[PDB]
Structures are given as structure tokens and as C-alpha cells.
Amino acid sequence: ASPFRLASAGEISEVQGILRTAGLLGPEKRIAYLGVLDPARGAGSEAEDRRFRVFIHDVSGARPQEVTVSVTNGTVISAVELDTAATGELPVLEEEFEVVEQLLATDERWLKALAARNLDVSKVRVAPLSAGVFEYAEERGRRILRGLAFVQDFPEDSAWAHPVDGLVAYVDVVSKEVTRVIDTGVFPVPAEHGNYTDPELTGPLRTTQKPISITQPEGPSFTVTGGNHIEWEKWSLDVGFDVREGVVLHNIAFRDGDRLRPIINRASIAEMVVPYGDPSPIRSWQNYFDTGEYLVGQYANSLELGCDCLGDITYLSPVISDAFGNPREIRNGICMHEEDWGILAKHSDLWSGINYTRRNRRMVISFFTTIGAYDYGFYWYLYLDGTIEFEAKATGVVFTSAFPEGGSDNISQLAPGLGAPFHQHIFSARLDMAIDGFTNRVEEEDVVRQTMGPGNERGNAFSRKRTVLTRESEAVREADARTGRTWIISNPESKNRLNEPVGYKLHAHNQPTLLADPGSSIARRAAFATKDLWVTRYADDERYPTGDFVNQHSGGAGLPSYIAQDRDIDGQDIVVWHTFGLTHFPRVEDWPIMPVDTVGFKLRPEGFFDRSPVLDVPAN
Amino acid sequence: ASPFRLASAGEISEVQGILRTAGLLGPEKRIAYLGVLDPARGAGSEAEDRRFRVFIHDVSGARPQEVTVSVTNGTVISAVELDTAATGELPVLEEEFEVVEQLLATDERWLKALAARNLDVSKVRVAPLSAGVFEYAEERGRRILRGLAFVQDFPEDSAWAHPVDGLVAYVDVVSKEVTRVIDTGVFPVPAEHGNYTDPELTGPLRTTQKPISITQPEGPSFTVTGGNHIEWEKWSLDVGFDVREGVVLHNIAFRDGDRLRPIINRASIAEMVVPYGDPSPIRSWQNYFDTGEYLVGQYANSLELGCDCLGDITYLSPVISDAFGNPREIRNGICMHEEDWGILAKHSDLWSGINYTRRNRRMVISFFTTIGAYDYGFYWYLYLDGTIEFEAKATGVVFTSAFPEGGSDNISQLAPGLGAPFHQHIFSARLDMAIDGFTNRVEEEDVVRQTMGPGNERGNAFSRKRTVLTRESEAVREADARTGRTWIISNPESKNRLNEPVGYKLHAHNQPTLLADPGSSIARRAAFATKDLWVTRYADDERYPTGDFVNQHSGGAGLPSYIAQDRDIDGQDIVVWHTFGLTHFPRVEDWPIMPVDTVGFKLRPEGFFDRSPVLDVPAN
Ligand SMILES: O=CCc1ccccc1
Ligand SMILES: O=CCc1ccccc1
Ligand SMILES: [Cu+2]
């Protein structure tokens, strides 16, 4: 009955049927995106109106369409033809990946480049990469992928060990034409293999690791109802899944006494971009919008018990559409479990003689995805004490190049001849806030140092200051780790027992933001990534910091256009967009396969409760 | 057999006997500090000499002494009379905590202050607080404690709920006189209790938490030999314990194939300071040097199974000296165990079809201490992938005051009438480096942004730079989160297979450093806390960033004095001192007992290995 339930195979089948009946899904059509829409703002609601948004591609060259259907009522709500040269191309189709290597294999320019390097075309893999927007005027309005080559010596060889530098091709995946083949000269193709399951590389496997057993004899402390509604240690939420964003959290709330108190209406990773910092023509165009261009949900791994998720695990198996509108299940794509998290609170008091210790635990909701060479785990945490946290785990294989003979300022050496171009992984968390309801505001809080003098004669005093962000034009904020800068989301109309507005404090990691020159294509296309914090007024159609269509789309949409409306955000329905990321200068230890590195953020209650919310936790 | 073994009860007994016999331990002498000295630098096979360092206090007013004895040979190596007005007072005696309350209880000024507030003197606890150095000339050379009052309504009451503001006393604990009683006026004593085990306050305890069972059916994967030598997953080290510093790690090394490779010679928390930022004269003097003034090792808790440490735990029970030279065991004061740490590495490769996943693990060495109101957990972590990490967990009860009517810029309100003065907790990690041996150097590494132009036509390039710190005068460094600043410790004479000096990279959290005015007493006595990273040349007697005798020292001791020697640190035996801390603006949620908050740092290998060091981890 819940409007936030996961999409079912039946719903997706029904969308297909509605589209078919309306003449919108003939044999030339492909679904590039399909997702359920969140219920509109309105508590005087339906029984249910389940609506789905669809991006429909046409393989014959006709204009694509954005369509919204109501599966409940069996109707097309709206359908509009898209001008992709203006508003952006549709996401890359999983079927268009194949096209590049296949087309190149019969291109005479490409064959000549491979022959120049004495490479067998049968052994040359081509990475099908998003093209972005640069100086190639003929690409405007066309679906283009750029190809980079890697040699695979045998079917189970890691081709990343053998990059073919000095060569790139551009391909029109609809007309099936190789538009350009650029060869800037031969580089040695690194010979050393990177096969991390090969005994000659691993050496004998450790026999020293004894088992660690994590079990729950009485089962988990959380409940799952209606498919995806979670209740755990006073927390309440709905776990959704979208093919673009991946796992999405809905209606995060906390049961404080008799009241269910909202905290966050919707939490997601609304975009993630991987800009490369190697100025070589072979890769200077390279920027992966994993979420916006590729759709990270689509590549969600099936998570194996014991391996990926250890302990008492409850799985969700979200359903997505394939390119033809048939449902496909991602079996065990989402892990849910609780884990011990050390000490929660502890004090040994001399005067009272009481020794008090309590243990902490956290609820985990996670999935793991794969985009070519690299892999990411997305983890959401709920803690006993009201803390909410997100963590990204970056791993996989590094994207490689040749390592230039006389060294490089933009590439590190991993192995003889083998380079790793510098890059970042930058995430945007979209937090549709609801601190005790929708009337919220944001303050920027800085530590304030004080000068020794009257009123502070010993020079020990320090303080803090808070600045309300009142309009969107003043709500684009940068980190300041030196002054302990955080952002507090409060409800000015809901006060704690001490008569202060209830709040939550956002703690960022203060990692560097986008490094690219402000005049670059990527700085315009990934404008969100250039600042740590954005606050907007809630609107239905403002979903991604990069807009609806990121593929081969210039600047013009996304957060910079939303912010321009300069709307009132002081005690209103607001959305926080937090930019955070990793800056990766790859090290030798990252090769042949990369150990997990992490980045994230957290929010802690800040006068939200009238006292510690974990006084009722037992010793046990 | 190892010179790094923990001190035994018998060794401490032998020290007592040596002192006694030399006439240095009469009935008016008190041991304020006692600890085993590390072995001197190298070199000659064995012929080992267990030496103990002792600070001897005299309760009749005579000059204290610093004494070094040899337990091995039963001799006194040296005994020096200390001039405490010059070089500082000895650490606070636990037996002196008692004295303050007792002396004040018969002081007429004190009793008048309590009578005015209608407080039963039998119910008034007095916190024995370190005095520091301020404007009071008569205190120079004297051994002073300052007292702040808290009301305890009954034996098991939390006195921290009932601070007595507007009142402070100064006492000479040797001559046993109250030197000052300052009453700046009456404040209401907050009436609400803060008894977190009172069902009235906690409410009904949760019945919703199901057990999490952590077991190792075949035992742990680490071995303990010689009492405190640990081998685990290629790591090697010795776990020491000092009454001042607490847990100390020795000889941290990694066995890389054939070689045992050193990384860190000695790791410790060599100071920790808690400066208060309330300019009220009642508290403006207040600065806890938990390590330097109080000695955090002596207040280490006994850790219970299931409560403090969960899973398969191996305990150490370190022995210390009491005030009279008797050995006292701290039963189960140190927890050692390994825990699962999620995914180590993961890649699902399209081209090879190989799906690869490995689990991560960390070795944990921890202890927990109590300093009056607040408590700290100290955690050292060793990871499979070579990473070394420290984490401090702060909890306990907040140190309280009145909340002024009208509010405050330096105090937050926890409960009606109840305040919590702003403060910091700032740590110093002393890392005696030994990256592949003692010939080390430190580089500051910043991200470098590049401008769009020739050689960077698309404006996507970014890079980094490294600056060698070559002498101590240039080795006092600041954080810069905005440019991703880290510090690399390398060995210029030990190169990896790519001909690069092996290295470890220090990742800081970039929290604010000491906030007090630069001209303040605390800024002078805790100068280490004003900068994030210091590098010194190793020397035997440079142990603490605040000097040997922190209590009532006038300023400038320790790191600023060391740095002043301006010694060569470029390819030399060097020591890294990292400052990191929490800036605490206490929240309503911190009351009546505080949920754990954390801070720390880590070091990651940086071209230390020739490839990932975890390729030989099995699939589990
Ligand atoms: O997005 C990276 C290119 C790629 C695509 C498919 C398999 C391996 C690598
Ligand atoms: O150092 C903090 C003051 C204190 C000392 C001993 C017991 C309770 C409180
Ligand atoms: Cu990376």
C-alpha cells in the first residue's frame, strides 16, 4: 500500500504495455532510462498514483522522447520530443558499448594504427567512453562514444595492464560511423601482466587468517515490512532503488517517545563525476559521470553472502527495465544488516562509584557497482545516537596509460612503462531535508577566535558564529576546515525543551573540490563539484545537480540554473546538495588491483533531542 | 628476553628497594612518576640494562628529585635535585585529589561561600584541578591545586549536574593552606539530576536489541610472545605501557617477503591538553594536561568482556608503581584483538569475466582512561594493506558550569540553568619514524591546480608538489585541507622497484588547532597544539612536546625549545609530532552522559611496496 514501495516486475511490464499501446515503443525504440517517480507534495493523498518516468531512444535516428506514465491508471501523462543538441543526449545504452570495438575493428585508420604497434586486432579491447562536449562541431546532436584501447593477451587477461597510448577514436553509435581516429604516436604497450588471481603474481596464499564469525542467534534487530520499509532502534525509513541514483533513502525519521519525528525526506547520491587530470589529447576529454551518463544502479553487483556482506544479512533484489522495457531483477543487489560499533558511552565516576558502559551499533544499507575499470560501494549508516552517515568505498582497477619516458606531472608510474593518470571521484549528496517537518533553514557555523583583552584578559576565550542562509543566491558555500566550518539544518518553528530550534549538524571531510580550471568544459558541466555546499528551495523537477540529460550536454542546466531563481530558503522546504570527493594520485600499492579508499560525510543531532537519546540502551 | 618487555611487578619492587636503601624513599617521599626507559640507540648485540626513571616528591617541603636506577645491576645511576620554579612541578599525586576538598572544608571563607548558597559542606565535592601559571607571584615554586565545587545530593549522585558557579579556591597542597577563596557571586545550583542509571531518567530500557555474536572458532590470527610481542598478518611490534603516555607501540615493522622492514620505531600519544574557552575568572585558568599533568596511564580502566571489548580478546595487564613504590597491576588494562573491516578490494571485470572480492581486517590495540569528568578510549589499528591508524574516542560526562541568564558566547546550555563551557581536546602523536631504517625525511605534499593554456588547452590538468623539510626551523607545518595537504615520510636511500624512495603518507583530519590567543599562557605552555605537524631530530631526552615537568611550568618547554636547535632533518633519524583534536561546543545530546565522538589520523604506504601487499589474501 506504501507509495514508496520498490518498483515491481509487474509495474515495469505494465509501463512497457502502456507505452506500446500509445504507439511510443515500437521496434526501433529503446528505453535508456526508467524509474518510478516520488509522490508529489501532498498529505491529502490518493489511494495511490504510481507514476514512471521514461527516456526513450530511437535507433533509427528519430528524436528521443521523455515520457511520464501512470501505471495505476494506464495512461500516458505526458510525452515530449527532445532536442538533444540543446538539452542533452540520453544516457549511454548498455548495448552501444559493444558497437565501438566492433566498428573500429573494420576501420582502415584503426587497423593501420594497430598494425603500427604490431597489435592483433582480435586481442584489442576498446573502452567505450562518454564523449563530453569539446571542439568537434560535427558531434552536436549526435550520439558519440570515444574509444581507448587495451590489449588482452588471452580471454582472462586483465587488459588494463596493457594500455595502448597515443591512440583514440570517436564513433557515432547510431549511424555506425567512425568519425575520427587520432594517432599521436606509438608508445610501448606495457608488457607486465596485472592478473591478481595468478599464483606467479600473488605468491602462495596466506594460511595465517583465522575465521571471524559474526552471527545473530535471535536474528536481526530490524524489521522489514511492505517490501522495503525499515524499522530499527527507533529509526524509520523506506529503502528505494533507482537505476540512475542507485539506493535512495526515503522518509528517514526517528521515534522520540510517542512522536515519529522526520529528519530527512529523501537522501541520495544525485551525481558522481570522475574527471581526469592528464592534459594528453588521448585522455584530456575524459570525464565519467558515473551516475548521470552511465546510470550506476544498472551496474549494481549481485552481492554474495560471506564475501560482500558478512553477518546476518537481509537482501533486497530491486527490479529495473532492460532496453526493451522488460523487467530485470538485480538479485541480492542491496545488503541490509546491523553491526556492532564499539563503545557508545562510558564513564567511571570517582565520587559516585558508578562505572557505566554501553555499546554502539549501526544499521547498514549498501550496494556495490562497477563502471569499467573501477568499482564503488555505497554505504548508508544509521547510529543509535541519531547520527546519519554516508560512506563511499572506491576500489577496482585503476584506469591506465603509458608512463612517459621522462616522467610526468599528471601521471604516476605503477609498473615498468605503466602509467595512472591523476583524477578525482566527486560525489553530490542530495539531501531533501525535513528536520521535524518541512519548515527548515540552514546556518553556516564557524569557530570564532577571540583576541586577548578586556572581557578576555587571559586570552583563553573562543566562541562560534552562525549565519542563516536566507536566499539561494547566498547559499553556495565553501569548506573552511581551519575554522571548523559546518552547516546546521534547523526547524525555526520546532524547539527543544531549552527553547532552541531543533537541528542537525552536517560534518564534511573537507576534501579538495573540483581542481579543473574554472574555464574548462568539465568545470561548466560539473559546476556542482566546484563548491562544497548548495542549498535550494525544493522543486519537483530539480532532481540532479547536473540536470536530466548529462550525456554530451554543455552547461546550462543543473544547480547553477536552479540557484539563479534566488528563492526564499529561510524556514521553507529546502534541499541540501553536498559535494565531496577523493583526489587520487595513484600509488604503486593501487596496482594490480586497488585496496579500498573511502570518503563521505555525516550528520549529527544538534539540540534535536532534549537529552541523550540513548539513555534507554541496556547493558546486556 | 626482549628489552621492550613490559615492566614486571618484581622490577618495580626492586626499584623501590634500590631507592629505599639509598635513602631516597623516606616516609615523606612520594613517587609521582615511575617508568622504564627505552633502550638507547643500538647497537651491541645484547648486554642489556633495564633502567627506570623516577620522579620523587617530598611532602614535607624538601626539593623533589629525578632519579634513574638500574634494576639489572641494583644501582642508582643518578639523582638530581629539581628546582621546580625553573623546570616545573612534578605530576599531580592521586593522593592530592583528596586534599583540596578536605582543606577547604574547614576554611572560613569557603564555609561562608557554601553557607550563603545553603549548601551542606558534607555534600560538596571539590574537583582538584591543575593550576597552570598566571598572575599570582606567590605561586611560583609552590605546589598548587585549584578547586571547583559540585554538589552531590547522595552517595550515588552525579555531582556534575550540580556545579557551584561563581566560586573557586586555590590551595597549597604541601603547606596545606588555602591561599585564596574567590566568590564572584551566587549562581543558582542547577537542580535537575543527571543520573543516567535512574529509571526515572532513562525510561523503560529497550527490549529491541538482538544479540550480535562475534567469535573466532579457531582462535585469533595474531600471536603474543615474550609477554607483549605481537605478530599479525605480516606486522611485527611490541606493545609497551607507560604510566604517563599509556599504551606505546614499539618496533612497528612489516615483513615484505624475505625482509622485515621497519616503519615506525615508537608511536605514542605524548601529550593531550583540554583548554577551556570560558573567560569567567572562575574557569579562565582551566587547562588539563591529561597526559603531562595527570598521567593518563595510571587511571586506565579494567576492561570487561562483552562490555568494553567484544569478540576474541587477548588482554595485557600492565604493572605500575603506587606513590610508595609498590607494584600495582591494572587488570585487563589493554585489549588486543582483530576485527573484520568490510571489503579490502573488489573488481568485476567485463572483459576477463573474473569477479574478485577480498575482505579486510585490522589488528586493534586499545585502552580506556578516566580523567575526572571525562573518559577517553585510545585505539591503534594495523590494517592488512599496510595502513596504520590512531583513533581517540571521547566520552564521559561534560565538565559543567552555570548557564548565565542572558546566555553566553562561551558556554552552551545542557539542561535548565546548566552550562557546558566550550573547550578543546588536543592530542600530540609522537612518531619516532623508521621508514626502512632511520635515514628518513619529510615532504609536504600539496595538490597543485593548473591554469588553462598551452600544454593544458582543455584546462583539465592538475598536479601536485612536494617540499622537503630540511631543517627544524622550517619543520613547523600547518594544515591546508583546501589543497589536500599531507606529509610523506620517506627513506631517500631505500628505493622501490620503480627507483622511487619508499614512503608513508600521513593523512590528517584537519580539525582546528589551539584556538586561544597567541599571547595566552596556554598558547605558550601548549605551543605544540598551535600547529598541525612538527618534525624534530631524534634525541634521547626529547620525549614530550610539553617538556618533562608540565605542571605549573611557565611556558616554551618541549617542542619550541627542541625546534630552536635547528638541526638537520634531511635524511636523518627523525621524529614526527602530529597535533590533532576535537573542538567541543557541547550539545544537549551530550547530557547527562556523552555519546562517543572521535578524532585521529592515519598513515598509508606510498610506494613503500612494489605492488599491492595484499595479493596473497585468500578468497575466504
Ligand atoms: O567505462 C570504462 C570502459 C569499459 C567498459 C566496459 C568494460 C570495461 C571497460
Ligand atoms: O580532574 C577532574 C576533577 C576530578 C578528580 C577526581 C574525581 C572527580 C573529578
Ligand atoms: Cu581513483
Ligand SMILES: [Cu+2]
Ligand atoms: Cu569535550
